[PDB]
Amino acid sequence: AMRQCAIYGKGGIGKSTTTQNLVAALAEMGKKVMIVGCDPKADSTRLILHSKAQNTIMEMAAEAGTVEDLELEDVLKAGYGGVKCVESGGPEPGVGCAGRGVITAINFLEEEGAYEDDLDFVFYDVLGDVVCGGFAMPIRENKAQEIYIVCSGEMMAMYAANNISKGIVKYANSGSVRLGGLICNSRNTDREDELIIALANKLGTQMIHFVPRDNVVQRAEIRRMTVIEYDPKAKQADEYRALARKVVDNKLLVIPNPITMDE
Amino acid sequence: MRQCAIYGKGGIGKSTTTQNLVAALAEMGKKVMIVGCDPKADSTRLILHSKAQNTIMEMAAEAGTVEDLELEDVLKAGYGGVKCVESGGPEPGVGCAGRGVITAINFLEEEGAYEDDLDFVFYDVLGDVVCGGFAMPIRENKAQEIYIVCSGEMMAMYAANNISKGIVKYANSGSVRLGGLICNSRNTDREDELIIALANKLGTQMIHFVPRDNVVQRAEIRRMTVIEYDPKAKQADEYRALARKVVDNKLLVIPNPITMDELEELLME
Amino acid sequence: SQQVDKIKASYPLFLDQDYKDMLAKKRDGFEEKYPQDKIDEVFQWTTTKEYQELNFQREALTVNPAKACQPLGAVLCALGFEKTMPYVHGSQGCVAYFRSYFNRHFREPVSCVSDSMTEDAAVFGGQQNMKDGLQNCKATYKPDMIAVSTTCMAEVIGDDLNAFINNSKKEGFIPDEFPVPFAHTPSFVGSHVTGWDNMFEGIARYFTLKSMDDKVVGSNKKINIVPGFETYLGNFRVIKRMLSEMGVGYSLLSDPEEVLDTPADGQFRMYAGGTTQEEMKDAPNALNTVLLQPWHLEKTKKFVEGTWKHEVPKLNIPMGLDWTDEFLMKVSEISGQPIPASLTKERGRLVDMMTDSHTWLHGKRFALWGDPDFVMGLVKFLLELGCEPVHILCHNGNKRWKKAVDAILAASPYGKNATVYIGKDLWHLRSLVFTDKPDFMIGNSYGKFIQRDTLHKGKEFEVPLIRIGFPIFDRHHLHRSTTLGYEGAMQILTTLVNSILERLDEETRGMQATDYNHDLVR
Amino acid sequence: SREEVESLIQEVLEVYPEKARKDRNKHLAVNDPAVTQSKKCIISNKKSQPGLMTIRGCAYAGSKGVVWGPIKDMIHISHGPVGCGQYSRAGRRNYYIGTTGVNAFVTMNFTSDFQEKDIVFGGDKKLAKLIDEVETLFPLNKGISVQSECPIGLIGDDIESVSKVKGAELSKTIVPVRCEGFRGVSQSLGHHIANDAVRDWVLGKRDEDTTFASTPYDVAIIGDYNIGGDAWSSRILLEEMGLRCVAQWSGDGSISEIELTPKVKLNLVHCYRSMNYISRHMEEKYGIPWMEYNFFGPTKTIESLRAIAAKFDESIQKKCEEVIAKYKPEWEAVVAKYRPRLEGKRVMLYIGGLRPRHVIGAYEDLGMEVVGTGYEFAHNDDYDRTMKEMGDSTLLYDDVTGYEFEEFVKRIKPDLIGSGIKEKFIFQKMGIPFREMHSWDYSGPYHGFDGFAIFARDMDMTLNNPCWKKLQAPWE
Ligand SMILES: Nc1ncnc2c1ncn2[C@@H]1O[C@H](COP(=O)(O)OP(=O)(O)O)[C@@H](O)[C@H]1O
Ligand SMILES: Nc1ncnc2c1ncn2[C@@H]1O[C@H](COP(=O)(O)OP(=O)(O)O)[C@@H](O)[C@H]1O
Ligand code: CLF
Ligand code: SF4
Ligand SMILES: [Ca+2]
Ligand SMILES: [Mg+2]
Ligand SMILES: [Mg+2]
């Protein structure tokens, strides 16, 4: 029943706001879902959880001092709508590899039995700014079967979306990892959609959906809650609903044709 | 010789701010070398008049070996006589990006880039993720002075704070210090003030405030510096001051990183 | 089935008919083995010249190497010091392997410890393991000194040894004063010999670097001897004995002989003998420092010449008649002590053994391999014996060394068919013995298999292996032998002449076929 | 006594610093045969405390060293620096029959031999070049496997792609195996990495092939590595009983045998720890049932032959009885000769996963009592199986440190100690007769009836050898 999706993008473009709101929609529909944050930001589980902060697997094991000497109930706490929320956490800046803490944490959840719990979906908020070994790790192992890239009309967003594609192409031989769609988060740009669909087409994948830029989101976030939860009545509430139905509905996963700088 | 490293969130002007500043030191006449560790490598582009600069990893890849490659080919001098090299990096999904950053610096020292009586060495770096490969200039004393570019938004500050936390950790072994935080304008209502309180909270000075202007943008399509293309303009004048201030500033301090919470208090104003 | 009166071990138990039938059934039934004719066709192919070319054409695959990694070199050197525990920073499987490789060759216990870095330790760094490891190791084994070396996992992730060790002391895990010399020992770079060189320069550097002003050269009137990576006890013993015979005062840095040779008297001794810390601290005060195996002692030569200002003499490893003479004369010049009557008699005897055994030894063809100093020493000696060394292979050797050896071969009319190969494995050597055949092979136990392959081609094509070198695992107590000095030369000469005579006897033992030459007196 | 053993464990732990001492006490237990669950008694398979001299190997040793290395037809490349391949070459006696270097390559050492250029640049191009080279030089090999050393996981090398691409090019099976030493905490994860590797790349090849003719009596020996020819001695007994042995895992094994294994009716599992992962998998995918069996000593073998035969029809059961009848006079002859010699002698054992519990019956068959036993890297299910076998108030240790072991031995004072090579020289010096359990001290095989005569004889020569009387000098 379970499918794995990785939300990837440049930071500050809405991967987290989007992953949480969409998960809320899947929750509302009734599908059990778990959110693993691989982003160091750790604001990945903040909306569903009504928490200023989620203690991470990396932060917790440090005090205990060892992995597997750490209890799962403590590590993962269920959110609104019953979505299990967890943060990988990561190393202190300047020491080792950040992306690694991501690996230690996922392997932690698997031994501990979070998966095969009959969760309908699993979502990893992964930072798409840099694709290198620690962060392209969910890609190496088939941690995220479906990769959806949040992207905007901006240059870093496109280049980053394009770089994540390169990551998916390299692990084409090794697993089942695939690129599901491109989710355009609006930047209030002039012709943002035609530009993303321009990118979506050149890359071999469709833009699954266009998210409107709106105020209710800002308001729901200060309230420390998701737009779906803060305002079910609202239009923006309706958009994330559209985004979620679409991820459940979309049947096309493809290995991307990364484009040139020039195209 | 003075080594400074520019650190910040992607898309915020670190390469652009650094090239123009480097060009100003060039105009003023200091001998300079720009080493770019950003995986993008558009870092050496404005000064060079090169659309894409062939990187050390890219170049050594065809040859098949490091130090089996020449510095003349690897390091190429730009406008104002500044030496330009691109660290570049590994194919995505493989290796450590920061590891590629280390071979280029090691390669440059063995070959002879340094002790070249080059007055300023500037390292363009990506501040989004701080890891040993990335914070490599910080672990080895590659760059003594560290300047963090930032904006009105959350990511620049989170990155600035993250870069600082990094500098706090490698404080005991080395002499690396944070000189100041360079502001890049987001046309935000209270950008200078937001940065100053944060900087003040951080323990170091905001060295300069830089206006968002289309002079920088027009100059860029032309693939040349604002300082080069339009020396007579206001934006060009701003980059000169930044250069005068960096050469001038004597304060390097270990930053006390602020809590994400303190960053929040700083967020509403 | 087993007769209880004479029980059969694997061999010749499996030689029994029920077992032979079973194996054949197994082979025919499930193995899907290539026909024997095909296996034969392929085996005859590898013995050829055509195959040697494809084999020597290899640029990426190494088969049957004649070299080991650096930490092995580091652990052995750390063993040379008194009450010193070798400690390797990095993963544990390496330590198990070093202890076992050493245990088998020396048939003695080998003490070594690891900080046990894990997958998690890979992301964070080796800092916790180093503090706990240093603290646990000291509490548990009570070593006076702990010498750190590192495994490749540690080298690739980049843990800083110096920073980790200082922070361990700073944080209070181990005393500030407790000695903790450390050397980075990347397995990818070099060999165990380089690993040995690094550990030593590090130990020497730790004890003598901070204080050099007080030190004055020649003040203590002893000569420092640095053994290098050595697996023969006789060698440590012989160097000391001669210096002692000569009356020369000396300090042997890194002497592992007592510990590798402790007596079974009912009590287990983790630590025995070793080079003293004070011996190491007072080292710069020696008249001079002599390096026994100069080829792998390059880093240490730089530290000793530059920091201690000792003018290290250029001397080859004291093997053979000429190099031993040179070593002794040199010691005589540095010490100021004369070469005694006793030592000159020994040299006399070596020559007498040489004159006595020259006809059997003359013209014999040998294929040999080893570490560069030992190989170099052996090649010099064989030429001194008039033997012909056809194939010389040093896996961990270099261009300068190869140049040095060719020079040695050029000096003797004997080294005419001789060729030096470096960077070539035993697989390469197998091809060489098959294409151009040596009378004998001088090397470690890894050559037991090359010999097996040759006998397979035929009796006449077999090249018997003579074991001198390291590791030797199929014979017992050979590590008690000596290869250095006159004594070492005598041992090597007796083994070679007797290996040759032993073989002649086997060849002439057939009744009424070849026994006409199976002589009583040879 | 129980209070005495408990005190001994407490007394020894006093030397260790607190984090290490606190952790270690969890690994030392006085045995209660009554306890059903091991976790109440002992904790196991946890990362080792640094600087304490643990006897554990790495994941590479478990995968390259134990599961993969024994296959005769395939070539195994140790990928990484030169040392791992070198230390482990011909170290373990997994006996095989073949023409080496031509069709069988077990004693051979094949390595990528990483230098710094490879560590900085990466090893994929080299691995591909090595695969091509391997193919021209050794044309009759039936497979290739890449065993990852520690640097492979760390430098970001992708060996799966190279293995997939080359395999496709050479129409040869290449198995990438990620047994990096840093992964796991003992030789144990490597068995699993190796087992999983076998299942993803080599088990399902003859998934759709029905050409091989299969009898209802077909069986596969799983987890017998033929040390000293143990599998061969084990194999002849099953064949005499009337079962047909299609495959041996992995001693004296061939890739063809492994691929033909799922066709077999029952899987007999000798070593539970190493290959239980593959056994469970086979039962889930193919429905083939698996049973643990013990061939050490006449009692376990008779009990084992009997259990295996029950799972089959009366002809097999009848044949089983003929065989027990046939070798009964041989084994009892051995007992008569050696029991009076070894009776009442206390034994202490330390070995990694299957043997500490398994050789107990044989020792007892000789009248020897095993006072204490432990495991290098055994899991708790292993410990669950152990306590029933171990007597009451006997000492049990997991991942015993060297220091702990010497102290336990000095106090307990066993007549004989069975352990590995690192442990052996220390004990002989101490004057305690030592037999190496891993290599059977270059003797064996110790399995089966034929193996038991060698084993009794070996314990007797070592335990009663004249050299032990001679240790203290006569002059006091
Ligand atoms: N569609 C949207 N409309 C309004 N605000 C949005 C939208 N998407 C994201 N945001 C806002 O922008 C900021 C960054 O979003 P986030 O999910 O944290 O990005 P990232 O995870 O890439 O850092 C938040 O303050 C969030 O409320
Ligand atoms: N003052 C400014 N006005 C307008 N655009 C600017 C200004 N400073 C920087 N930029 C933008 O930044 C880009 C150059 O730097 P960029 O690609 O963002 O990399 P980095 O974040 O590493 O400097 C230009 O494409 C331009 O849009
Ligand atoms: S944990 Fe690593 S995989 Fe394991 S056995 Fe050790 S090595 Fe190898 Fe070691 S001996 Fe040297 S330092 Fe490396 S290369 Fe090999
Ligand atoms: S792999 Fe990525 S996260 Fe890890 S050290 Fe390198 S750059 Fe940092
Ligand atoms: Ca001994
Ligand atoms: Mg985020
Ligand atoms: Mg740039």
mmCIF file with all atom_site columns, N, CA, C and O in Angstrom, chain C residues 348-367:
data_model
loop_
_atom_site.group_PDB
_atom_site.id
_atom_site.type_symbol
_atom_site.label_atom_id
_atom_site.label_alt_id
_atom_site.label_comp_id
_atom_site.label_asym_id
_atom_site.label_entity_id
_atom_site.label_seq_id
_atom_site.pdbx_PDB_ins_code
_atom_site.Cartn_x
_atom_site.Cartn_y
_atom_site.Cartn_z
_atom_site.occupancy
_atom_site.B_iso_or_equiv
_atom_site.pdbx_formal_charge
_atom_site.auth_seq_id
_atom_site.auth_comp_id
_atom_site.auth_asym_id
_atom_site.auth_atom_id
_atom_site.pdbx_PDB_model_num
ATOM 1  N N  . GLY C 1 348 ? 86.206 -14.686 8.193   1.00 0.00 ? 348 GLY C N  1
ATOM 2  C CA . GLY C 1 348 ? 87.080 -15.712 7.611   1.00 0.00 ? 348 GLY C CA 1
ATOM 3  C C  . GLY C 1 348 ? 86.337 -17.009 7.312   1.00 0.00 ? 348 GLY C C  1
ATOM 4  O O  . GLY C 1 348 ? 86.478 -17.636 6.260   1.00 0.00 ? 348 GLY C O  1
ATOM 5  N N  . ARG C 1 349 ? 85.516 -17.392 8.264   1.00 0.00 ? 349 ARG C N  1
ATOM 6  C CA . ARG C 1 349 ? 84.697 -18.586 8.226   1.00 0.00 ? 349 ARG C CA 1
ATOM 7  C C  . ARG C 1 349 ? 83.648 -18.437 7.127   1.00 0.00 ? 349 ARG C C  1
ATOM 8  O O  . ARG C 1 349 ? 83.359 -19.380 6.397   1.00 0.00 ? 349 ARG C O  1
ATOM 9  N N  . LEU C 1 350 ? 83.076 -17.259 6.991   1.00 0.00 ? 350 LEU C N  1
ATOM 10 C CA . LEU C 1 350 ? 82.074 -17.094 5.975   1.00 0.00 ? 350 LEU C CA 1
ATOM 11 C C  . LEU C 1 350 ? 82.720 -17.365 4.614   1.00 0.00 ? 350 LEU C C  1
ATOM 12 O O  . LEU C 1 350 ? 82.185 -18.135 3.806   1.00 0.00 ? 350 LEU C O  1
ATOM 13 N N  . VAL C 1 351 ? 83.914 -16.832 4.401   1.00 0.00 ? 351 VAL C N  1
ATOM 14 C CA . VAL C 1 351 ? 84.622 -17.006 3.121   1.00 0.00 ? 351 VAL C CA 1
ATOM 15 C C  . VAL C 1 351 ? 84.978 -18.459 2.898   1.00 0.00 ? 351 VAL C C  1
ATOM 16 O O  . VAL C 1 351 ? 84.903 -18.943 1.767   1.00 0.00 ? 351 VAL C O  1
ATOM 17 N N  . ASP C 1 352 ? 85.377 -19.134 3.979   1.00 0.00 ? 352 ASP C N  1
ATOM 18 C CA . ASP C 1 352 ? 85.756 -20.542 3.948   1.00 0.00 ? 352 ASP C CA 1
ATOM 19 C C  . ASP C 1 352 ? 84.482 -21.307 3.535   1.00 0.00 ? 352 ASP C C  1
ATOM 20 O O  . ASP C 1 352 ? 84.561 -22.229 2.728   1.00 0.00 ? 352 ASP C O  1
ATOM 21 N N  . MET C 1 353 ? 83.318 -20.956 4.064   1.00 0.00 ? 353 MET C N  1
ATOM 22 C CA . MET C 1 353 ? 82.091 -21.657 3.686   1.00 0.00 ? 353 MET C CA 1
ATOM 23 C C  . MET C 1 353 ? 81.835 -21.373 2.208   1.00 0.00 ? 353 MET C C  1
ATOM 24 O O  . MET C 1 353 ? 81.444 -22.254 1.443   1.00 0.00 ? 353 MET C O  1
ATOM 25 N N  . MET C 1 354 ? 82.116 -20.160 1.780   1.00 0.00 ? 354 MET C N  1
ATOM 26 C CA . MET C 1 354 ? 81.904 -19.792 0.398   1.00 0.00 ? 354 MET C CA 1
ATOM 27 C C  . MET C 1 354 ? 82.840 -20.573 -0.525  1.00 0.00 ? 354 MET C C  1
ATOM 28 O O  . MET C 1 354 ? 82.388 -21.113 -1.517  1.00 0.00 ? 354 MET C O  1
ATOM 29 N N  . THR C 1 355 ? 84.110 -20.710 -0.183  1.00 0.00 ? 355 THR C N  1
ATOM 30 C CA . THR C 1 355 ? 85.045 -21.432 -1.039  1.00 0.00 ? 355 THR C CA 1
ATOM 31 C C  . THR C 1 355 ? 84.601 -22.888 -1.053  1.00 0.00 ? 355 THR C C  1
ATOM 32 O O  . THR C 1 355 ? 84.572 -23.508 -2.094  1.00 0.00 ? 355 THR C O  1
ATOM 33 N N  . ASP C 1 356 ? 84.236 -23.428 0.097   1.00 0.00 ? 356 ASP C N  1
ATOM 34 C CA . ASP C 1 356 ? 83.798 -24.824 0.254   1.00 0.00 ? 356 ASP C CA 1
ATOM 35 C C  . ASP C 1 356 ? 82.555 -25.190 -0.546  1.00 0.00 ? 356 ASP C C  1
ATOM 36 O O  . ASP C 1 356 ? 82.477 -26.299 -1.022  1.00 0.00 ? 356 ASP C O  1
ATOM 37 N N  . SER C 1 357 ? 81.556 -24.313 -0.600  1.00 0.00 ? 357 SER C N  1
ATOM 38 C CA . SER C 1 357 ? 80.304 -24.543 -1.332  1.00 0.00 ? 357 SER C CA 1
ATOM 39 C C  . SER C 1 357 ? 80.172 -23.887 -2.720  1.00 0.00 ? 357 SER C C  1
ATOM 40 O O  . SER C 1 357 ? 79.131 -23.994 -3.370  1.00 0.00 ? 357 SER C O  1
ATOM 41 N N  . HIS C 1 358 ? 81.231 -23.287 -3.238  1.00 0.00 ? 358 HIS C N  1
ATOM 42 C CA . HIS C 1 358 ? 81.145 -22.611 -4.546  1.00 0.00 ? 358 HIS C CA 1
ATOM 43 C C  . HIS C 1 358 ? 80.772 -23.412 -5.757  1.00 0.00 ? 358 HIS C C  1
ATOM 44 O O  . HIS C 1 358 ? 79.998 -22.882 -6.541  1.00 0.00 ? 358 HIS C O  1
ATOM 45 N N  . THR C 1 359 ? 81.314 -24.617 -5.964  1.00 0.00 ? 359 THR C N  1
ATOM 46 C CA . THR C 1 359 ? 80.946 -25.394 -7.157  1.00 0.00 ? 359 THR C CA 1
ATOM 47 C C  . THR C 1 359 ? 79.415 -25.713 -7.206  1.00 0.00 ? 359 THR C C  1
ATOM 48 O O  . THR C 1 359 ? 78.802 -25.571 -8.257  1.00 0.00 ? 359 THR C O  1
ATOM 49 N N  . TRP C 1 360 ? 78.763 -26.124 -6.126  1.00 0.00 ? 360 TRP C N  1
ATOM 50 C CA . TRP C 1 360 ? 77.312 -26.395 -6.216  1.00 0.00 ? 360 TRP C CA 1
ATOM 51 C C  . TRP C 1 360 ? 76.505 -25.094 -6.485  1.00 0.00 ? 360 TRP C C  1
ATOM 52 O O  . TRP C 1 360 ? 75.520 -25.082 -7.213  1.00 0.00 ? 360 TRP C O  1
ATOM 53 N N  . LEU C 1 361 ? 76.852 -24.032 -5.792  1.00 0.00 ? 361 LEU C N  1
ATOM 54 C CA . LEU C 1 361 ? 76.192 -22.746 -5.940  1.00 0.00 ? 361 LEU C CA 1
ATOM 55 C C  . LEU C 1 361 ? 76.401 -22.026 -7.272  1.00 0.00 ? 361 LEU C C  1
ATOM 56 O O  . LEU C 1 361 ? 75.520 -21.310 -7.783  1.00 0.00 ? 361 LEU C O  1
ATOM 57 N N  . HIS C 1 362 ? 77.531 -22.268 -7.896  1.00 0.00 ? 362 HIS C N  1
ATOM 58 C CA . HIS C 1 362 ? 77.793 -21.556 -9.136  1.00 0.00 ? 362 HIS C CA 1
ATOM 59 C C  . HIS C 1 362 ? 76.862 -21.708 -10.306 1.00 0.00 ? 362 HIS C C  1
ATOM 60 O O  . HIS C 1 362 ? 76.591 -22.790 -10.762 1.00 0.00 ? 362 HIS C O  1
ATOM 61 N N  . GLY C 1 363 ? 76.434 -20.561 -10.818 1.00 0.00 ? 363 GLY C N  1
ATOM 62 C CA . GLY C 1 363 ? 75.542 -20.539 -11.940 1.00 0.00 ? 363 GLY C CA 1
ATOM 63 C C  . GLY C 1 363 ? 74.100 -20.874 -11.651 1.00 0.00 ? 363 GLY C C  1
ATOM 64 O O  . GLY C 1 363 ? 73.298 -20.976 -12.574 1.00 0.00 ? 363 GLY C O  1
ATOM 65 N N  . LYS C 1 364 ? 73.738 -21.082 -10.400 1.00 0.00 ? 364 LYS C N  1
ATOM 66 C CA . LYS C 1 364 ? 72.355 -21.404 -10.153 1.00 0.00 ? 364 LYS C CA 1
ATOM 67 C C  . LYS C 1 364 ? 71.451 -20.231 -10.440 1.00 0.00 ? 364 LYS C C  1
ATOM 68 O O  . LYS C 1 364 ? 71.742 -19.126 -10.062 1.00 0.00 ? 364 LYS C O  1
ATOM 69 N N  . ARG C 1 365 ? 70.308 -20.491 -11.046 1.00 0.00 ? 365 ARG C N  1
ATOM 70 C CA . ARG C 1 365 ? 69.357 -19.444 -11.381 1.00 0.00 ? 365 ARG C CA 1
ATOM 71 C C  . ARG C 1 365 ? 68.225 -19.297 -10.360 1.00 0.00 ? 365 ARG C C  1
ATOM 72 O O  . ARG C 1 365 ? 67.519 -20.236 -10.049 1.00 0.00 ? 365 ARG C O  1
ATOM 73 N N  . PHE C 1 366 ? 68.055 -18.088 -9.854  1.00 0.00 ? 366 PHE C N  1
ATOM 74 C CA . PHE C 1 366 ? 67.027 -17.815 -8.864  1.00 0.00 ? 366 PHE C CA 1
ATOM 75 C C  . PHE C 1 366 ? 66.052 -16.726 -9.210  1.00 0.00 ? 366 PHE C C  1
ATOM 76 O O  . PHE C 1 366 ? 66.424 -15.732 -9.799  1.00 0.00 ? 366 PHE C O  1
ATOM 77 N N  . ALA C 1 367 ? 64.811 -16.912 -8.799  1.00 0.00 ? 367 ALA C N  1
ATOM 78 C CA . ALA C 1 367 ? 63.758 -15.946 -9.029  1.00 0.00 ? 367 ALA C CA 1
ATOM 79 C C  . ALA C 1 367 ? 63.476 -15.582 -7.552  1.00 0.00 ? 367 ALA C C  1
ATOM 80 O O  . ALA C 1 367 ? 63.292 -16.485 -6.736  1.00 0.00 ? 367 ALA C O  1
#
